[PDB]
């Protein structure tokens, strides 16, 4: 019943260019079996979003990778909101919401923005630059460390950390396994600045922790729920913010309409992350026998959601392969959908939105002119080099 396929989605080959297989992917059927590594795999928008929004049948905390928390150990303590399940999810993910709220919007808007004109006006004076050095990476870490509150020593250990923890997601193999090899430093830093004392007054952290004594997290929960930023809020902004320059400098007809309406930078950033898709996939693991497109998937049994297929998926959309700024994006699955949908989506979206803006009113044309290399994650999709020189307005 239930097509077998041996592509592996966690090969560099696939990595390299996945949307033909996805596509064959897509087409075997709502359901597929990956031989490979014996999980069931759901790749269309329907079934994406399907599972995602049964979260009870589909549960988050035997693990959102490969690895089944009921078989092996995790490689560190559980996330106390990615990897729960409600009602034990449902405190914490209230006060991650309302420690990254509109209200703290408001308060770091105009800082965010400030950095992004300031580090754009940077680069055109440079001219030639790497979009993922000097741009997706050196903006978010312009500004995410500090609003998060953590001194300047060590913040060198953020993004190996993140690349750590989505390369822990795959399945076992020379990615994952060279990851975990390296941790040591990372893991060390990282949970000392989870500590209470080592937070800023004011900062994301800070914040976590004040929020100890309503209910609805204990002091002891609140270093896992920092952690959970400095697992995810950096790493995924660089590719965001990355794959939002890199559609721009390959559709320049969108950059030229970008820089007609600014107000369009929103926009233009959210359909990057469904162009992309940044985060490509996560696992869930079934709870009990049930029926997924016509098929029959046993108790205890990984099923993988392919996030970047589902937002290419013709059933879904028109034109999925054209970069479209004035798309309306509203049901892409690039944050996710759901009780789990990306709790930072608020400060992803700021982010990009501010440097977009800055974009479209400072820069006349972004051309490639340099050998582009792609970074190779199991979870993450998004560029090592992209080699640009920027033409100012
Ligand atoms: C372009 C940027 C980003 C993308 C594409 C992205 C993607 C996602 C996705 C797909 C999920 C759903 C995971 C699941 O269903 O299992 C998620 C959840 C989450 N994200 Fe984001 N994210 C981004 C930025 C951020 C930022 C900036 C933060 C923090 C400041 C953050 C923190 C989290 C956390 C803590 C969760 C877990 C939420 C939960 O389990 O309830 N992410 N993200
Ligand atoms: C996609 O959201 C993520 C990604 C990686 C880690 C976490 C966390 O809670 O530690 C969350
Ligand atoms: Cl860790």
């Not at 999980?39 to 399907?50: I, K, Q, S, T």
């Amino acid at each position: 019943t239930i097509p077998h396929l041996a592509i592996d989605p966690f090969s560099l080959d696939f990595f390299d260019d996945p949307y033909p297989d996805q596509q064959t992917l897509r087409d075997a059927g709502p359901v597929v079996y990956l031989d490979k590594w014996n999980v069931y795999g759901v790749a269309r928008y329907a079934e994406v979003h399907a599972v995602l929004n049964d979260p009870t049948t589909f549960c988050s905390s035997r693990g959102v990778g490969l690895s089944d928390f009921k078989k092996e150990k995790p490689w560190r303590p559980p996330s106390l909101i990615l990897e729960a399940d409600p009602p034990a999810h449902t405190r914490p993910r209230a006060v991650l919401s309302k420690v990254l709220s509109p209200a703290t919007m408001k308060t770091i808007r105009d800082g965010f923005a400030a950095a992004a004109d300031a580090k754009v006006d940077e680069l055109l004076q440079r001219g030639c630059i790497d979009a993922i050095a000097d741009l997706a990476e050196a903006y978010p870490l312009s500004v995410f460390p500090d609003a998060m509150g953590l001194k300047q020593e060590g913040r060198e250990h953020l993004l190996p950390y993140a690349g750590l923890v989505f390369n822990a997601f795959g399945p076992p193999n020379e990615l994952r396994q060279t990851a975990i090899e390296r941790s040591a430093p990372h893991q060390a830093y990282v949970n000392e600045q989870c500590q209470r004392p080592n937070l800023a007054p004011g900062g994301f952290g800070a914040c976590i922790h004040a929020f100890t004594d309503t209910g609805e997290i204990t002091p002891d929960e609140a270093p896992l729920l920092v952690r959970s930023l400095l697992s995810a809020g950096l790493d995924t902004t660089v590719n965001g913010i990355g794959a939002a320059v890199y559609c721009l400098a390959r559709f320049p007809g969108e950059l030229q309409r970008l820089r007609s309406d600014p107000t369009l930078a929103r926009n233009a950033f959210e359909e990057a992350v469904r162009f992309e898709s940044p985060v490509q996939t996560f696992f869930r693991t079934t709870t009990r026998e049930v029926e997924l497109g016509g098929a029959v998937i046993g108790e205890g049994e990984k099923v993988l959601m392919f996030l970047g297929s589902a937002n290419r998926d013709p059933r879904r959309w028109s034109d999925p392969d054209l970069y479209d700024i004035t798309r309306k994006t509203s049901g892409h699955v690039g944050f996710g959908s759901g009780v789990h949908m990306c709790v930072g989506q608020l400060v992803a979206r700021l982010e990009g939105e501010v440097m977009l803006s800055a974009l479209a009113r400072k820069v006349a044309a972004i051309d490639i002119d340099g050998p582009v290399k792609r970074r190779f994650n199991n979870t993450l999709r998004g560029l090592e080099s992209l080699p640009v020189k920027l033409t100012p307005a």
